[PDB]
Subunit: 358 residues, 4 copies
């Protein structure tokens, strides 16, 4: 009969960062979905072609970038953000263009580390909000199998109230819960646990979608069924469904945030046989959603999750959305006020339910 709400629940007016609560007004210019450190080794796509073996063991170098872009998971070096010093330098680029906060949804199974997040936040001066929960079935630890939906919910609640991974750092978002195109029983159990935790903690809920598929409405049905708040639920990886305006708009209508977290990402995922859309295509979709009154549901990010996405390795880094995509949205007809809404007001809205709509 005790309340389990986070001291930084959506009706508190505060946000839980790895360094403690901050007023929602201090969030400022924000990147809603970025990985600062992680481990994607489980997604390694072994080259079966004899001609393509050199791509697996070699460290990222300028001469192999083209091939990596057509199959980023083929390279072992690429699939792990484990360079803290580089992470710090790359994040400083964001801070250099006004960046103030970063939401890191790296959860259980893919390298979440509060100790490392605090080091980055302290050295960069950029505020960091940490996520929680379980990812895709393949990344789930041996122990998850014995856990019930409520057991998973309990773990999340504890991280929002007590601490995480043996530290007193607490989460500020229940996030990047894995839902694959197969939407396995494990994943459903995981999502139900996250949704129940959303109700118990009052924290925003972020769900990883299989972007090239269309399970978003089924995802929201489940969240809604568990009693969670759709207006504080974020649907990740919307970029690939840019050509389905009805799909995207009806989702926004239900209240969920539509996160276009793949800005700048243009890879072809050989494994899945899917292509990331262009920024122009995404820009038009965003323009369409805004024209239909859903501007306050749109979120932008890069979803940096591999080394080749850092500028040091030829990538766009964490300052690309701010430096290059915003000007592109301008070219598509969006005004300054809209840009402020996208990078500042909407992120705040995800965490603060008292913020008026658009």
């Amino acid at each position: 009969s005790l309340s389990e709400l986070s001291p930084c629940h959506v009706r508190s007016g505060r946000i839980m960062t790895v360094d403690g609560p901050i007023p929602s007004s201090a969030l400022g210019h924000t990147l809603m979905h970025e990985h600062l450190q992680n481990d994607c080794r489980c997604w390694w796509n072994p080259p079966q072609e004899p001609e393509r073996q050199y791509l697996a063991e070699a460290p990222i170098s300028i001469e192999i970038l083209s091939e990596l872009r057509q199959d980023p998971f083929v390279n072992k070096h690429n699939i792990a953000l484990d360079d803290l010093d580089l992470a710090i330098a790359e994040v400083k680029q964001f801070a250099a263009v006004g960046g103030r906060s970063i939401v890191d949804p790296t959860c259980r199974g893919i390298g979440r580390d509060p100790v490392k997040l605090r080091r980055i936040s302290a050295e960069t001066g950029v505020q960091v909000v940490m996520g929680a929960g379980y990812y895709l079935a393949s990344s789930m630890p041996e122990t998850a199998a014995r856990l019930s939906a409520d057991d998973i919910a309990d773990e999340i609640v504890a991280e929002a109230l007590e601490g995480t991974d043996g530290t007193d750092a607490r989460i500020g978002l229940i996030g990047e819960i894995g839902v694959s195109s197969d939407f396995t029983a494990e994943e459903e159990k995981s999502l139900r646990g996250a949704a129940r935790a959303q109700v118990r903690t009052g924290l925003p809920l972020m769900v990883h979608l299989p972007g090239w598929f269309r399970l978003a409405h089924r995802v929201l049905d489940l969240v809604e069924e568990e009693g969670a708040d759709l207006r504080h639920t974020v649907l990740c990886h919307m970029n690939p469904s840019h050509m389905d305006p009805v799909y995207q708009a009806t989702l926004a209508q239900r209240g969920a945030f539509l996160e276009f977290d793949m800005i700048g990402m243009d890879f072809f995922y050989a494994d899945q046989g899917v292509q990331c859309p262009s920024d122009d295509e995404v820009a038009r979709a965003i323009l369409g959603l805004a024209d239909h009154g859903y501007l306050d549901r749109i979120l932008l990010s890069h979803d940096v999750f591999v080394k080749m996405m850092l500028t040091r390795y030829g990538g766009n880094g964490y300052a690309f959305v701010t430096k290059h995509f915003l000007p592109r949205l301008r070219r598509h007809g969006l005004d300054d006020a809209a840009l402020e809404t996208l990078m500042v007001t909407n992120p705040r809205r995800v965490f603060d339910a008292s913020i008026e709509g658009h």
Copy 2:
């Protein structure tokens, strides 16, 4: 006329390479539009902000590739393909995947050099066809002002029959004739001279178009009134108008080749404020044209023209179309017969009028 026809005119069944004539059947798997060596200094886009000054004088390195992709012309090192050894290595990648010939439309003003082409063909074993004529106005030498359209046609005729740039290497195509969005009086004179040379030499004609505009029909009107053969006229840079199927299909109907020579190029040209389309968007356009029966008018290439487009500098190289785009077209529905038509039959059709449609 007759005496001025190239030994390899479009009704000869032969093709003129920098190393001499070859039967059209020997052309094989081809890239219709690539620059092996060139000079694009005249297009350098000086960095306005003193904060981007480093992007101008610094050499290309993996750490600045993102910025360069948003403004390729800001970097001086990037705007000139001048390393022959690298050109040779990059071209071998194409040969390694079945590549047999490359058409280099580098013409006057942008660094055409028959000696270097011959070295590349010698060391790679890849057949090279050399272009000719004048490019965009800003690249034209001061001596071009004195030339009449006929004088320009005469120069082209001489390179088709006797030699080029002080060598005995003869051209096998007229082109990458520059037409800017402004279509200046000089560019018009240049194009008329090219069209007249097309009639006189009987060689294919290739025209550079400002891809983000829609001047193609005006271009064909002029080529046609000058008496040139539209069925052996190639319209370059069609990638940007992928969203205008009527425009593209009507051009194909008139008989011209639609060259999607920007496969793999995804830069944002800041100077002009235009964006290169994605390969998926281009693939859909190609499928559409084929659905309407215009498959025999489609050509593919990369238009490699700056350093960052080579694999050595993080780019796609000359083997990308073959290795990665053909599979993409396969994913879109084109069968193997169609891929053979695109990389072998069509290129042959450009140079040989006897190939059935």
Copy 3:
């Protein structure tokens, strides 16, 4: 204090017809929006060109139908359904093809008459449901100016519980509430009173939209803030917005019924300068709405409201949707189950909240 619910509220399982309550299961094959008798003289479009003067005064004859189709409101004889015997014969055609019920939304200002409706239901054997409330501004009674939103709600509640126009006939639907492209303060007051009546009586709410505009979301916003049930709110005249799938789908997602009540109407309204879409264009829009999972929100009717729409005058009559449009929907891809859903299940859903969705 004390309940004001109609004996046939949406959770009653019954429906109020001019002849009393009937189980919702008895509604059957239904036309959700038809006028059996009405008066549209206040919408006459006088021909400025003296050459077209003859069309204004002349009676409807086969010789001038072409001209009338290009400007229906030019003819005085056309803008009033006043022949009860013809109405009865025309309605018998609907019954002749399986029709069981008709919903007549003719309200105050446009000729609502419970006496006539009863004679029609009596002689045709077709069940008739009567609407209520006020229509567009220009048709509103002088007295409506003094009425407050609550007074309007009170009038509607009285017709749902006691009787209407001096009779004991009670209403079964609240509506064909007028909302013009101008959405005047009076129309807003009218709609607010209607929505309050929806909450108090529990009866369905039907709203007239200026189809060629996009005010539907603003309409639902108002019905929503007044506490009314969007799930039993019908948005009329959706046909003209067939080319705006995002707009239509997002309205359906909010829960409102999308009424394509202009089936068969292909006139050009000279006055407004608007053109009625073709049945093929509408069929495609309907297919799309269904493809997106909104089939249970789709309603179909003719909105017969002028003499020229009756078969006697060369028009389609009341049996057109059933005899000709359903087959067209089949040619487009809909099966008999879907057709059954459109003409029976959905109409029942309008009046009965116990009907399962999907």
Copy 4:
């Protein structure tokens, strides 16, 4: 030696009342039937509940049903009321109409005697067509006829007379091509095409509007050596949603005739629906936007009694009185309306008229 005295390069047009300079054609309807017989398309109702729609004369109370199955009514499928035809045509002259091209040919009731009565009484100039229509309407005698025999007949009607009169044809046309494109219809079309070469008159071809046989039709016509720039493709209305199909046909040089303006019936016998005027207007705008305004023709194809104002139809003045205003609402200016109703019809019959909007 077989050119009509009013061939397309003569500057003249052959009407049923003799030659007239092309400049005299004026405001014209390119495809209308003044008198005809469509009894062969009788679509009798096999259900008792629709038996009344068969032998009953058209009346106001059955119009809805007829619009859903035009051929179900006997009275409706024959324009045999000359007095009514005159009255209806006068409506067209009343709004500026000067000429009407009647493509009614062999098999569907062509009658020079009746056309002359109509022209004399209304003051409207009439151009008469020729050739054979759809397979199901060809006479038994056409079976033995070879393509050349068919062309011979057309030539005689162009130079000597028609059906025993001295009235001569001014257009070869409304040649029948069904969705099946039968052997007999192909022979008919080849004969028409050869006659186009011999007489130099324009060629008009009936197309199964809901299909896509136009390019195949133009292929045949072209190989028979006929003039594509004076070939008219009828019934383009139904392919309005295929801008590439329509634009490419226009690029080949043929006229695109939207002769079903105002026609909104559902042909139960074919299971096809006539498009709305708004949809057609959009298609016309698109073609003009891509520079094909000079290839666009408009008409009603009045061919059954219910299409006459007396029977609730639109009559022969609808295009002029109601569709032009619709085109204006869509964005076309007055000069474009002049181009559509006067200049283009003249272009059909006169090759000396230069192109453009």
